[PDB]
Design an enzyme around this catalytic site. Structure first.
Site, PDB file in Angstrom:
ATOM      1  N   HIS A 226       2.120  -1.441  -3.390  1.00 19.44           N
ATOM      2  CA  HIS A 226       1.220  -0.293  -3.450  1.00 19.44           C
ATOM      3  C   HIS A 226       0.828  -0.163  -4.910  1.00 19.44           C
ATOM      4  O   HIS A 226      -0.340   0.018  -5.238  1.00 19.44           O
ATOM      5  CB  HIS A 226       1.934   0.982  -2.985  1.00 19.44           C
ATOM      6  CG  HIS A 226       1.152   2.240  -3.213  1.00 19.44           C
ATOM      7  ND1 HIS A 226       0.357   2.814  -2.245  1.00 19.44           N
ATOM      8  CD2 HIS A 226       1.039   3.030  -4.309  1.00 19.44           C
ATOM      9  CE1 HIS A 226      -0.212   3.903  -2.735  1.00 19.44           C
ATOM     10  NE2 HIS A 226       0.186   4.054  -3.981  1.00 19.44           N
ATOM     11  N   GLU A 227       1.814  -0.278  -5.785  1.00 22.19           N
ATOM     12  CA  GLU A 227       1.558  -0.160  -7.209  1.00 22.19           C
ATOM     13  C   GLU A 227       0.725  -1.312  -7.744  1.00 22.19           C
ATOM     14  O   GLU A 227      -0.077  -1.131  -8.654  1.00 22.19           O
ATOM     15  CB  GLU A 227       2.871  -0.094  -7.993  1.00 22.19           C
ATOM     16  CG  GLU A 227       3.775   1.055  -7.618  1.00 22.19           C
ATOM     17  CD  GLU A 227       3.030   2.366  -7.490  1.00 22.19           C
ATOM     18  OE1 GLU A 227       2.333   2.751  -8.453  1.00 22.19           O
ATOM     19  OE2 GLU A 227       3.147   3.008  -6.420  1.00 22.19           O
ATOM     20  N   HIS A 230      -3.044  -0.838  -7.418  1.00 21.11           N
ATOM     21  CA  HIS A 230      -3.620  -0.031  -8.484  1.00 21.11           C
ATOM     22  C   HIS A 230      -3.861  -1.000  -9.619  1.00 21.11           C
ATOM     23  O   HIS A 230      -4.895  -0.973 -10.245  1.00 21.11           O
ATOM     24  CB  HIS A 230      -2.657   1.083  -8.923  1.00 21.11           C
ATOM     25  CG  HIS A 230      -2.570   2.221  -7.949  1.00 21.11           C
ATOM     26  ND1 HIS A 230      -3.682   2.784  -7.365  1.00 21.11           N
ATOM     27  CD2 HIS A 230      -1.507   2.916  -7.476  1.00 21.11           C
ATOM     28  CE1 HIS A 230      -3.309   3.773  -6.573  1.00 21.11           C
ATOM     29  NE2 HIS A 230      -1.995   3.874  -6.625  1.00 21.11           N
ATOM     30  N   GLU A 264      -6.826   6.447  -5.148  1.00 17.77           N
ATOM     31  CA  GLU A 264      -5.483   6.592  -4.582  1.00 17.77           C
ATOM     32  C   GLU A 264      -5.519   6.542  -3.057  1.00 17.77           C
ATOM     33  O   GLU A 264      -4.648   5.927  -2.435  1.00 17.77           O
ATOM     34  CB  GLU A 264      -4.838   7.907  -5.015  1.00 17.77           C
ATOM     35  CG  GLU A 264      -3.469   8.131  -4.390  1.00 17.77           C
ATOM     36  CD  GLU A 264      -2.435   7.126  -4.892  1.00 17.77           C
ATOM     37  OE1 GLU A 264      -2.226   7.069  -6.123  1.00 17.77           O
ATOM     38  OE2 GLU A 264      -1.848   6.403  -4.063  1.00 17.77           O
ATOM     39  N   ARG A 366       4.766   5.836   5.827  1.00 18.42           N
ATOM     40  CA  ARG A 366       4.250   7.160   6.144  1.00 18.42           C
ATOM     41  C   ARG A 366       2.857   7.026   6.752  1.00 18.42           C
ATOM     42  O   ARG A 366       2.080   6.156   6.368  1.00 18.42           O
ATOM     43  CB  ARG A 366       4.196   8.010   4.877  1.00 18.42           C
ATOM     44  CG  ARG A 366       3.452   7.335   3.743  1.00 18.42           C
ATOM     45  CD  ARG A 366       3.864   7.881   2.382  1.00 18.42           C
ATOM     46  NE  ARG A 366       3.438   9.259   2.168  1.00 18.42           N
ATOM     47  CZ  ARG A 366       3.632   9.921   1.032  1.00 18.42           C
ATOM     48  NH1 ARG A 366       4.243   9.329   0.012  1.00 18.42           N
ATOM     49  NH2 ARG A 366       3.225  11.178   0.912  1.00 18.42           N
TER      50      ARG A 366
HETATM   51 ZN   LIG Z   1      -0.815   5.172  -5.458  1.00 18.66          ZN
END
Ligand SMILES: [Zn+2]
Ligand SMILES: CC(=O)N[C@H]1[C@H]([C@H](O)[C@H](O)CO)O[C@@](O[C@H]2[C@@H](O)[C@@H](CO)O[C@H](O[C@H]3[C@H](O)[C@@H](O)[C@@H](O)O[C@@H]3CO)[C@@H]2O)(C(=O)O)C[C@@H]1O
Length: 1280
Positions: A226-227, A230, A264, A366
């Site tokens: 996920h990081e 970015h 995001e 999630r």
């Molecule tokens: Zn994020």
């Protein structure tokens, strides 16, 4: 492909793959950190991130950094080489897990090859500059000290350890002179604070959790991917900024939090990208495209590098060209290729997302960015292949932990993680005080509601339309299957060498972070959701509690706990008994619990609501003070809107005007300047819809989410209180007694927990339904209003333009501007999202026939209102009579009318004509002395016209007509005519159900469920049916004419014979019996008696005997050829008397299974209907005589209803008494033979028989049985 290098923290520095880096934010001072090259361009620095944090901020304190995180602290993480090494080997195992699949490998390959451009906005176009903190980092070669020899290298990513909060991972980009190259097309050295062992936990099933831990923990490999996304965004310089989603923080119940940028939400993927409207989706797109344009321009002008003369310009122009996918002609001129730019942008924004990746690696996560997060857990040892592997993560097949993400389940894989010392977590809270007495609520639990400022206004601007103007759509989606198949994506261009000149310009903005009070004290005296939930908990230092249905004592007394269940349930729970009776008591209080929780599956079909959870209001008192009154009723009136804690102010702008101006001359080709104005109209519709969906998801569905959650807690707290009470009562007993008490605490919880699960499932469908309902009725319509308005203004914009130009087409291309705008875009949620949960909510909502109701007139507080939910205006004039039985009367007075202004923004209009009208109606009998006008005069009763077009319901005598009139004036009809020459009719002056449906080819009329008439309506053109609806008798009616109607409603779709039969049975249902006309049967009310098996027969007290003889009814005696019937006001007058009740005699309603006295009048005395207690035969003449108490006769009768289908008939059963199951027989009529000295014939008498007992049990129910009666009281609708 990708190579993951191996090493140990204690390996020696070689200035190549193990160095002494001077981090960017070091400003080139402070000191150096030992770094490792885990792959090309990627470095791992196993030390705490301290840039911007005070050394003290690492300890747990009264503060918090982020407001939505249960923050774990521990300054001792990575305080040793052995820890630093473990951090290293763990990072290594993760990258290996990431590259174990094509998808993650491509991510890494993209991050390695996406080298930061050389220079930023400040660098002249013709230049390159490696001498800036976003392009180069310094490594040290000295030994006894720093400074001595500094080398420079290029990097794409530096991953440090965590900062103060272990579980708060974050990718950080570099800012120089208030600007970010990672946001302007250049990209720049990315940084990250990552921790692998302390993962986040997200709420979900784990057993049924009414005792055992609930939820799942994250795979640190996804947390890292996920990081890295970015990072990817940063490296390609598309991590642009735009209009963020910002929380509304005006009310005490709203969740306070940082603004949320699209980047995001794009990174998370799933439904979250839908919260970013299509307008902003385009804003970003355009800003990124704009950035690339600058970069493609530089490549075309770049010549020299004034930082590292060692840099090869050609080598770099070929790398960037491949990075950004620009096209290079045969001359070397670089340019942007829209198609390749496209696939690339979508790939980086919608391809690599945490949702797509988790699905690919089969990792659970999630459901949304906006979802409650639980406290974090510590994974015991990611370096242990029995607990976590490269190939499978935690979901290992050998441990049968692949199915259902069991490996991540907390209740199942407890050998994999550790709970953490809450005495180490920090949570931002809101202390809600009154005025003494305050309650702490975790910011997480408050409502998240996007402020209006969060949404773009780009829809209100203008649009110059030309032959060039084309459609613009950014589908927040990308087929991950092709992204995994190499063709475009991965670059095969050599990667330049990382060595270069040293950095000397350490200029750069270093972010400073500070904590903030973790507790924020606010004041309010409201008692909404949070207080009601609090009222349901109790302190740990208390074991003796009792339930109360009083919210207030619960707040006041610590040993008092609030319960929203029944008074009965609450009484039993507080009961205290003997050990010998403990088992039983436990068995029933738990069953009670189950029964109460399952009241969440309550139906309410009569009010056209399939699912309703009556207790939601008492349980949370959320929204419009819903814990007061009757929840079911209040919902029936206002709907899903009463559950909302806040009614949001939507952004629905006036769609900016168009301009086809800029284009004149007699060119017959540019004509498309209009053709493109139309398709641009379709874009404006879609975008508006997307604008709505975006606000629904972040201002409405977020609130409902909090409710579903609050109910889970509410139901759980309930079971907990119950278990606590049980445990207390049990431990009061001695050990001797306990030994004999049969109690199984695991079966108690199991049963308690199962009930909750059944409830949650109901509560969920209920709440999703509302959410969709609020979308469709309180949001979409308002958006339609402005679109239909823009339409109009756009219709005059055009046409008039086809006028200001030339030319044969001008006419056949003006019609094109008609047939088009005459087609509104149907809203389809699947267009703006692909999330399965959402799509399923929507499809479920569109499959419930009831949600097709656009008008539903009902009586509420002496007025008729529309309950459909679309807010139709209902004007009820003085001449109308209303009763709480939902019957309304229309008379001959000019003021006896109802005016209904339909909602103009609802779907209903489309090529075909598809809608239905259903209603009950009682049509009064014809006056015998005016049969002529009756059969000749036709009068309208419901008229719905606009521009001389529409539908109409009228009546001519004994016929009811449905009439259609399309814009051209063409008319078709269909009708139901009930015979008026019947001895006894099933329709004249009697309530009956009407239903009219229309599809593209037929208009069908249904009566009481059955189809009676049909009519072809293909020839029919468009029928405008959204005009005002006028209910009123209009025509040449008689002063005495009137009509009764009930349950009037309209569906914007053709109802099926099935839906009709069901509607008929639902509205027919009642707890009481009915009289001949169809009205509630009543006590103390004169009635003549009718026998369904002997239509033309009536009862009469025989002159010389205590028996009722049966005579033939008399009939219409006048000389008319149009009418004929049998008298109904003949025979003895009966009056049903209540058996019980010794407190006066009023006049109530007669219910099934009621005990009565069947009396009647004889002269000036009230006699009664009896049966000789000792008849030994199967049948016997009933004994009719004055009221008295004779022990030789049964006087008590039970009124029943054996028919399961709708009927006004009922039956009278004679029993021994109010308990015995001893049935004497049923009341009916019998034929006897008589032979005397003069007369020899047959005669029927008022009889009682056992024979009927078995006949009433057969199917289908024999309506022709002689035991079937109906009561007929005088009625103005029937005169003879
Ligand atoms: Zn994020
Ligand atoms: C209205 C009518 O004539 N039709 C039924 C009548 C009638 O409903 C009742 O008499 C009054 O409510 O009842 C019929 O017979 C049943 C019962 O009512 C009496 C008849 O007097 O007993 C019958 O059983 C026996 C009957 O008494 C004997 O004559 C002999 O035939 O054997 C039968 C059976 O063992 C029966 O239970 C009737 O036909 O009179 C049924 C009618 O449909």
């Amino acid at each position: 492909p990708v190579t993951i290098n191996n090493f140990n923290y204690n390996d020696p520095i070689d200035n190549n793959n193990i160095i002494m880096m001077e981090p960017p934010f070091a400003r080139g001072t402070g000191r150096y950190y030992k770094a490792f090259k885990i792959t090309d361009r990627i470095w791992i620095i196993p030390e705490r991130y301290t840039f911007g944090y005070k050394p003290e901020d690492f300890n747990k304190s009264s503060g918090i950094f982020n407001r939505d995180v249960c923050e774990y602290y521990d300054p001792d993480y990575l305080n040793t080489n052995d820890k630093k090494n473990i951090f290293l080997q763990t990072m290594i195992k993760l990258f290996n897990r990431i590259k174990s699949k094509p998808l993650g490998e491509k991510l890494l390959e993209m991050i390695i090859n996406g080298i930061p451009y050389l220079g930023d906005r400040r660098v002249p176009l013709e230049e390159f500059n490696t001498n800036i903190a976003s392009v180069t980092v310094n490594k040290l070669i000295s030994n006894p000290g720093e400074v001595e020899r500094k080398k420079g290298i290029f990097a794409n990513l530096i991953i440090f350890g965590p900062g103060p909060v272990l579980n708060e991972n974050e990718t950080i980009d570099i800012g120089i002179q208030n600007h970010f190259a990672s946001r302007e097309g250049f990209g720049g050295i990315m940084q990250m604070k990552f921790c692998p062992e302390y993962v986040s936990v997200f709420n979900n099933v784990q057993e049924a959790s009414i005792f055992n831990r609930r939820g799942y923990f994250s795979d640190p490999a996804l947390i890292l991917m996920h990081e890295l996304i970015h990072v990817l965004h940063g490296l390609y310089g598309i991590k642009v900024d735009d209009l963020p989603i910002v929380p509304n923080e005006k009310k005490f119940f709203m969740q306070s939090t940082d603004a949320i940028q699209a980047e995001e939400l794009y990174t998370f993927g799933g439904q979250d990208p839908s919260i970013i409207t299509p307008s902003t989706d385009k804003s970003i797109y355009d800003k990124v495209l704009q950035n690339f344009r600058g970069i493609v321009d530089r490549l075309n002008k770049v010549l020299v590098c004034i930082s590292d003369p060692n840099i090869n310009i050609n080598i770099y122009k070929n790398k960037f060209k491949d990075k950004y996918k620009f096209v290079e002609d045969s001359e070397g001129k670089y340019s942007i290729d829209v198609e390749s730019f496209d696939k690339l942008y979508k790939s980086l924004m919608f391809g690599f997302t945490e949702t797509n990746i988790a699905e690919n690696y089969k990792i659970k996560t999630r459901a949304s960015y906006f979802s409650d997060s639980l406290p974090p857990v510590k994974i015991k040892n990611l370096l242990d292949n029995e607990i976590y592997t490269i190939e499978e993560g935690f979901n290992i097949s050998d441990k049968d932990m692949e199915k259902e993400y069991r490996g991540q389940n907390k209740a199942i894989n407890k050998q994999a993680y550790e709970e953490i010392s809450k005495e180490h977590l920090a949570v931002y809270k809101i202390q809600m005080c009154k005025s003494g007495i305050c309650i702490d609520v975790d910011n997480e639990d408050l409502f998240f509601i996007a402020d209006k400022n969060s949404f773009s206004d780009d829809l209100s601007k203008n649009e110059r339309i030309e032959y060039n103007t084309q459609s613009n759509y950014i589908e927040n989606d990308f087929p991950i299957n092709e992204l995994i198949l190499d063709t475009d994506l991965i670059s095969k261009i050599e990667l330049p060498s990382e060595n270069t000149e040293s950095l000397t310009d350490f200029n750069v903005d270093v972010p400073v972070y500070e904590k903030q009070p973790a507790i924020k004290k606010i004041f309010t005296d409201e008692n909404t959701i949070f207080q009601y939930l609090y009222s349901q908990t109790f302190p740990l230092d208390i074991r003796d509690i009792s339930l109360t249905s009083s919210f207030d004592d619960a707040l006041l007394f610590s040993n008092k706990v609030y319960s929203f269940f029944s008074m009965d349930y609450i009484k039993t729970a507080n009961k205290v008994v003997e050990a010998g009776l403990f088992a039983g008591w436990v068995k029933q209080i738990v069953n009670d619990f189950v029964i109460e929780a399952n009241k969440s599956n309550t139906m309410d079909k009569i009010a056209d609501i399939s699912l309703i959870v009556p207790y939601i209001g008492l349980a949370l008192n959320v929204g419009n003070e819903t814990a007061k009154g009757n929840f079911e009723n209040a919902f029936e009136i206002a709907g899903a809107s009463i559950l909302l804690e806040f009614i949001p102010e939507l952004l629905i702008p006036v769609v900016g005007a168009f301009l086809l101006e800029s284009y004149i001359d007699n060119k017959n080709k540019i004509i498309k300047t209009i053709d493109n104005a139309l398709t641009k109209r379709n874009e404006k519709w879609s975008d508006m819809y997307g604008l709505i969906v975006a606000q629904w998801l972040s201002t409405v569905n977020t609130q409902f989410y909090t409710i579903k959650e609050g109910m889970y807690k509410a139901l759980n707290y309930q079971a907990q209180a119950l278990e606590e009470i049980i445990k207390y009562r049990y431990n009061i007993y001695s050990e001797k007694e306990k030994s004999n008490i049969n109690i199984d605490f695991n079966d108690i919880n199991s049963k308690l927990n199962e009930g909750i699960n059944q409830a949650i499932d109901n509560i969920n469908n209920f709440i999703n339904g509302c959410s969709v309902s609020y979308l469709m009725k309180k949001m979409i319509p308002l958006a339609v209003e402005k679109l239909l308005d823009f339409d109009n203004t756009l219709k005059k914009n055009l046409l008039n333009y086809i006028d200001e130009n030339k030319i044969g087409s001008a006419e056949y291309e003006k019609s094109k501007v008609n047939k088009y705008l005459k087609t509104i875009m149907p809203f389809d949620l699947s267009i703006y999202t692909n999330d399965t949960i959402l799509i399923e909510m929507f499809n479920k909502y569109n499959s419930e026939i009831l949600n097709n109701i656009i008008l539903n007139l009902r009586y509420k507080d002496n007025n008729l209102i529309d309950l459909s939910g679309y807010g139709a205006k209902v004007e009820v004039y003085d001449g109308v009579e209303l009763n709480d039985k939902n019957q309304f009367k229309l008379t001959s007075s000019a003021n006896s009318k109802i005016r209904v202004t339909q909602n103009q923004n609802i779907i209903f209009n489309s090529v075909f004509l598809d809608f239905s009208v259903s209603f009950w109606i009682r049509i009064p009998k014809y006056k015998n002395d005016g049969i002529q006008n009756y059969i000749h005069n036709e009068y309208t009763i419901i008229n719905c016209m606009k521009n001389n077009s529409g539908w109409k319901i009228s009546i001519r005598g004994n016929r009811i007509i449905w009439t259609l009139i399309d814009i051209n004036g063409k008319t078709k009809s269909v009708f139901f005519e009930y015979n008026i020459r019947e001895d006894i009719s099933e329709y004249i002056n009697r309530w009956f159900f009407v239903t009219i449906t229309n599809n593209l080819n037929n208009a069908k009329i249904y009566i009481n469920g059955k189809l009676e008439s049909n009519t072809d309506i293909k020839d029919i053109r468009e029928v405008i049916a959204n005009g005002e609806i006028i209910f009123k008798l209009d025509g040449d009616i008689d002063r005495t004419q009137f009509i009764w109607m009930k349950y009037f409603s309209i569906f914007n779709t053709e109802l099926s014979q099935s839906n009709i039969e069901e509607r008929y049975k639902i509205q027919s249902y009642s707890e009481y019996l009915k009289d001949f006309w169809g009205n509630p049967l009543m006590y103390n009310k004169e009635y003549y008696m009718f026998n369904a098996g002997n239509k033309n027969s009536y009862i009469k007290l025989k002159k010389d005997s205590p028996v009722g003889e049966i005579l033939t009814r008399s009939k219409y005696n006048q000389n008319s050829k149009y009418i004929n019937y049998r008298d109904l006001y003949i025979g003895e007058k009966f009056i049903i008397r209540r058996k019980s009740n010794s407190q006066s005699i009023n006049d109530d309603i007669v219910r099934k299974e009621d005990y009565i006295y069947l009396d009647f009048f004889n002269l000036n005395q009230e006699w009664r209907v009896y049966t000789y207690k000792y008849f030994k035969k199967e049948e016997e003449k009933l004994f009719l005589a004055p009221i008295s108490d004779s022990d030789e006769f049964y006087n008590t009768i039970q009124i029943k209803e054996y028919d399961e289908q709708p009927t006004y008939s009922c039956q009278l059963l004679f029993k021994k008494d109010e308990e015995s199951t001893d049935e004497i027989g049923l009341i009916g009529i019998h034929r006897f033979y008589e032979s005397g000295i003069v007369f020899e014939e047959y005669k029927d008498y008022f009889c009682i028989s056992k024979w009927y007992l078995k006949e009433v049990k057969r199917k289908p129910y024999n309506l022709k049985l002689g035991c079937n009666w109906q009561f007929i009281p005088k009625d103005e609708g029937w005169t003879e």
